Amino acid sequence: VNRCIFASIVSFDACITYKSPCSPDAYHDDGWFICNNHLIKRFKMSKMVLPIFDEDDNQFKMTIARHLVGNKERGIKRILIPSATNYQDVFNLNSMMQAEQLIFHLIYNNENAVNTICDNLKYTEGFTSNTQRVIHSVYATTKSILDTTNPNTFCSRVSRDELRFFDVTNARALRGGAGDQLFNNYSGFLQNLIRRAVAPEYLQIDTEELRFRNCATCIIDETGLVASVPDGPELYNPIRSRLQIRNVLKFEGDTRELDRTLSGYEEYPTYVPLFLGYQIINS
Amino acid sequence: VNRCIFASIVPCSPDAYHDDGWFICNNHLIKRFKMSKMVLPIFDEDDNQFKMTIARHLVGNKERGIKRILIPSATNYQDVFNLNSMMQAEQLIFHLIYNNENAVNTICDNLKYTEGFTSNTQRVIHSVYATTKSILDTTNPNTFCSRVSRDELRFFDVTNARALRGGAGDQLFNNYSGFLQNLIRRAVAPEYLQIDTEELRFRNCATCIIDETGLVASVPDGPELYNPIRLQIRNVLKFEGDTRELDRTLSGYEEYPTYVPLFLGYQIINSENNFLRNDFIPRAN
Amino acid sequence: VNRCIFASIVKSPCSPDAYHDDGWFICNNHLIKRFKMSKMVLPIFDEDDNQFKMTIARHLVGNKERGIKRILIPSATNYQDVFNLNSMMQAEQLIFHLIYNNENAVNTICDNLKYTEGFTSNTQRVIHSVYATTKSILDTTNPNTFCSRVSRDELRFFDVTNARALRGGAGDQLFNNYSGFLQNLIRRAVAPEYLQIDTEELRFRNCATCIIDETGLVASVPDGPELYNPIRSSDIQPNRLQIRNVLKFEGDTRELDRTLSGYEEYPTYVPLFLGYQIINSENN
Amino acid sequence: DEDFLKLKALEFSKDIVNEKLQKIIVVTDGMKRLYEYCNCKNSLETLPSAANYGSLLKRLNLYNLDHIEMNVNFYELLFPLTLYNDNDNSDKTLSHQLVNYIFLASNYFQNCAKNFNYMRETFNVFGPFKQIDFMVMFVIKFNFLCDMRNFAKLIDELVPNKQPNMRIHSVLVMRDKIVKLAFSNLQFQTFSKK
Amino acid sequence: LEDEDFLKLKALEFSKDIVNEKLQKIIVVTDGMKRLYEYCNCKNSLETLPSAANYGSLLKRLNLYNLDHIEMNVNFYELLFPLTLYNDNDNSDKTLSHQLVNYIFLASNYFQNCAKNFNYMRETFNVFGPFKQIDFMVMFVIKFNFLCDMRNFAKLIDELVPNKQPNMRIHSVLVMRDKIVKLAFSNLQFQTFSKKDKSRNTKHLQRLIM
């Protein structure tokens, strides 16, 4: 079975065939409907999991991601997700293919763009094949998810059964606050996406609070998710994959046997997990 | 035959065996003065050839002060030649060169104070000494009948040559021991040469300025030019050698040497051209 | 394959160089033809491999040359007089008129040839194909236009003042007005004394060697006497006797060098240093 | 000597000053009795004719304005010209020269910072009472201020564009960064309780 | 409003007690200036960006005054280094080093975050400060708030500290941090994008005499 929305890609016309298909994960079921391929391709994250003991071999395991942005990029370069205000200029959708463009207009509820698109199709041979019903079946899938999400989920937990505050725990982080409410502005689909992408800083269970990190890695943004520290210099990203500068001031040391000696000891991974927000769960 | 002045060492590179006025191996020239023995070839329209001695600058760009200094003043000599890092033989040699008789006799008594001298190693040590001594003795231009420059003069400023002006740097050159002056005249290729009937400008600008402190490498002005070459930092700055290969063409293109040649001072020949008396006499002005 | 403009032209045997990747619009043989130069390179790098190998050239301008002969490349002003293309083939005249944009002369040639039967019967295909090829070669670069498709704005500067002249400097306008391939070849030819790395500045010679006049690129000392140039004389009218005086060596004892020959030697050619270069930290 | 182009610059500045926004109090500034003896306007620093007026100690004593370890924002000092060239358009009418002038000024700051390491004592020889510790930087700035005072006369009728030249601004940044970096070398060496 | 009176003298006590500046010289806690200097009357926080709500009256005062007088540079090494060249008589050196270096790097990170976040700060001030010179006011107030909290810190640490002999262990990272500050000002493009012409444009250079 296939679920990645991009794996659902199809062509209205005979030339292109998108022959860089979705990662196997498209066939998997995290409820993300996103090949990690595309995750990289458009957002620059890699999905990950944290297992957590249920005080037992029973566990809750939370999916997260890691951002892939370097230390040098700034502003738009660091934007991960836009606003509907600025998705267009952020992405250059015109460079993207028309199915991509229309799907983004669905995401942003741009009925005007949808209408203009149908009005362009009226005369097209894709319209002669009525392949627009591919888009309408994508709409059916979407609407099913949405009636599973926007009415449900956060709204369901308005029952108070659960709450996540995305607000920064540190009140000194003046850049926080109102963005946690601006969260409300986005399509609940997106909201689900982000909230399941991002780990909380704390969990309330009435047994005990748990704290998972000293200090939040992520921040809410004025248009959409950005890879930025709350404050200070950006923490180093060892992303590890024109005549420009390549300088790196290596230490002199020539010893290598030490490495073979030390293979026995924890080779600490250096990825940037997403820690942000206050999590509350009943019982 | 090997006649590096560091054959005194009690090893020199094979070039030491040429009987030539460097009187040093390139080994020791580098190891103490960070230059490489060179000759400049010179040619005519006829294609006839001539040659001049040279040794390109090699000490690193960034360092400053004494680091720029290649050879200090006798007044400042130990500030480079921080003897206590240096072997006794080395120290004694340098003291002699600088005429430091005081230190000479000091070492003379230090031989006694090295109570191991009872072994009479003094015989070997002093034989090496006298060997060395001989060399300076031969260098001495002041020896009565030693032959001197007929057609030739050198000065260390354009104006000092052009009008015999009293350059203080020229005077301090003269005040240097005769061997030092010899070695300078041996090593230093001019910015200019006058000829009985002709003049030649080799560059519009000199390489380096030299001062009373010693052999100073400094550029007259502006930044130094590039000079390419355990709890420490290799610290390598490195660049995008993308290897957009072009050797297929570029192998034919002439490759300019990547070096810092010497163009220093104003030579004059102003008498019947007779240079090829090929003897390394002191040849003083 | 051969990229020499004279390779495009239609004895005049090219050097093999312009058959190769580096895209110089002239073989090294014809780099003699009016231009007194040889193309050259400078291996350059950090402390490993060799990274950059920047091209350069040496002229062989005679020390005794003055005036026009001191001019390396005439300005669009008076290039016709400097060259006397009347001494040359119509193809060469046409080509130069193109480079200098002397489309008026191009018109005059086309008018002349129109009524000749040798033009129509055979030569028209030569003229038109050659023309198109040349122009297309120009358009292959023309960084003033066409995406600036070749290279970048490059961050090069040539007009740097010497420390002691007035607050002058001009005629980069003329530089630009020159057919851009001329500019690009100058970029081939002339290293700056200085390069800004994104984080560092580096210097390669104590002093500049060349000047730009409104008349053209000129090989002149900034001051004082010209340096003596030992033109190697290995390479190039007998209709009329050709005279020279030349002061030359004489003397024996060259065998003395027999021992010294093993030492390191310094090639003595005249490379061209003029201007500044930078690398952007970012193409902001 | 005459005010001459001083009046022409005054006229041009009057033509720009169509606005006042006056009566705002200048608390910050106490520019008592500025004087403009800088007629030598030399490109280089060596002049004993500048030390000729070493009596500056006296006016200092009356109103010091000592400035220890002075360092200069070349970028900020030169920025205003960046928009003014475009009274006309589509030519480097002056910018062709402004760029090389900027190069020269930057190189000046590259080199005089080096030469300071001995030129102090030459100024003590000009006057053994010295206090060169500050007066050296004083003159170092002042002479380029005179250079700018005349350079403005060399450019005259130039008015603020709204469009910046990205190339020129990048040139300004990339020179000024190294200019400021040069000051890092300033250091002190065991004076004890001075 | 109740207890400053002691510290008013304290800031001047030792400086009036001493007359012995021989090369390096201090403005005596700068302790003589107009109402603006008299306004710094609260325990503001050095740890974080300014509490913009605190300063509205200060902004309304500043509206009376011009602000094209401000150098961008902190002058970090320049001003701070001279006022640190002094130590205890060979005791508590651990202590002195600790508070000195910690305060140093505190100011370091303070300016680092100021430069990284200046947009949010100036905009959040303008939200209620619609004043035409509001950007210059924000820059000035940043400098002045830092200076005032520093003055309070100095006032508090004011101690005998007669000893004066450089510790190059202290003065080494001096250059690293100061050059990082200047590099921060380099990273400040200063954004010449069609707004500074609304200034007095460097006072038109004041007839080339200022």
Ligand SMILES: [Zn+2]
């Ligand atoms: Zn996909």
Ligand SMILES: [Zn+2]
């Ligand atoms: Zn040897």
Ligand SMILES: [Zn+2]
């Ligand atoms: Zn050819």
